Symmetry: C2
Subunit: 259 residues, 2 copies
């Protein structure tokens, strides 16, 4: 089981450097980044930087491609959906340089007045298209709470869709903040996810640094040990309390104590 830190960067080199150096200084084993459009960033420097600090990049976020450019893998407009798929393909090329996972969060899109079934099938089609367009890329579907989406809110929802995609290149990314709302019994949900649990995000009930809310992290980590989770636990929380740096330190401290 490894700890990583999600670092926020502008739409960049400055924020990345600072973030990675902070992660190294605190003790994180890896870092996780999030970029809207990767084609404008020079990843060769990124790799150099990474190699320099001996700090791997575990995953690449794609949420902004949706929040900023409105790209969706279930967009009703086919030309837009095609562009969404092509954008994610570029995310995988970046991920391939570091052997990282590609996060499929809000980029999957919402029902937008359509049935759950039509949305799901369109999503499955796009995912299959991505699996065709890329050879080794690995994707992780992140169930999000009801306020952020009406498509894939729970781990069980994700599992059912994974069975329809039928590929070990697609797994699940569970997030404690979102599970706090959507999951009935978190430990049991994780056990059902089992080996399909590819990545993990941590933040407290208020989305602050772990240890600053009331989320039960102990039970979570006991379950993760029980199922033999040997992948990444990435800190993805608001810069609270006291800012980005303090939050990272606090989160690392409480999580380390439990691992």
């Amino acid at each position: 089981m490894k700890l990583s830190l999600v670092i926020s960067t502008s739409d960049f080199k400055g924020d990345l450097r600072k973030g990675m150096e902070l992660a190294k200084r605190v003790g994180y084993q890896a870092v996780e980044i999030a970029v809207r459009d990767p084609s404008i960033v020079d990843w060769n420097e990124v790799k150099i930087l990474s190699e320099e600090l001996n700090l791997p990049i575990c995953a690449i976020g794609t949420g902004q491609a949706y929040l900023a450019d409105g790209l969706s893998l279930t967009h009703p407009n086919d030309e837009i959906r095609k562009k969404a798929i092509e954008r994610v393909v570029k995310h995988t090329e970046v991920a391939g340089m570091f052997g990282a996972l590609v996060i499929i969060g809000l980029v999957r899109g919402r029902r937008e007045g359509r049935s759950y079934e039509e949305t799901e099938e369109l999503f499955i089609e796009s995912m299959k298209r991505l699996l065709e367009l890329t050879e080794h890329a690995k994707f992780v579907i992140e169930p999000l709470n009801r306020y952020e989406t009406d498509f894939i809110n729970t781990i069980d929802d994700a599992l059912r869709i994974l069975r329809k995609i039928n590929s070990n290149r697609v797994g699940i990314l569970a997030d404690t903040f979102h599970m706090n709302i959507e999951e009935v019994n978190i430990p049991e949900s994780l056990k059902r996810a089992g080996e399909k649990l590819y990545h993990f995000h941590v933040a407290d009930s208020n989305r602050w640094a772990p240890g600053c809310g009331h989320f039960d992290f102990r039970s979570v980590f006991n379950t993760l040990k029980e199922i033999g989770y040997n992948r990444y636990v990435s800190v993805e929380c608001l810069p609270l309390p006291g800012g980005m740096e303090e939050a990272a330190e606090i989160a690392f401290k409480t999580l380390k104590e439990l691992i």
Copy 2:
């Protein structure tokens, strides 16, 4: 002496109301809670008759749809709309007066809308004081809501700050477990800070399903409620899950009843 109430969903009405109230009575609830967009289009004398026939008081009236449907806000940047919001709420108080019910100030307070928290809060305090000058018996409860529903008054402390500025015992707090599960650091401690200001309470599990179908820690909450002497209403406001409206209300009642009696 805590009492149990059920929030009943009503279309924007008699049909839904009667079925909801009869359900509450059959399950054992001591009162119901309703929500109406505009009270002016409802014959409330028929409602009172129904309440009397079923011996089911109406402990609180929601006003959230006044915002969600009519866009009325007590902190709206357009003073014209702000006045209308106040006028709409006054009508809710007139209805509340017929039942001795509390008026809930939820989403009707509005959002920051790109403004500072200080200005929004000042506008709100001004609207609440106006509401108090306009009413002689109405009692209001401010309900903190999670970040996704609003950026104005998310925690019990936010409300407490506002209450001290309003300085009126006719305004109190309505805390909701589903919302607290997100916004409050430590729920028991939050409730102790509210103390006597806690006028009404909403209950729903972490997933907003009937209490007992999530992972929210209700035991600790009720221990604190006892410790603080809360003796008013605990109203169930959850999604009709699992199994529907009736099943959810039944499960909710059973969960709460056992917590109380013990």
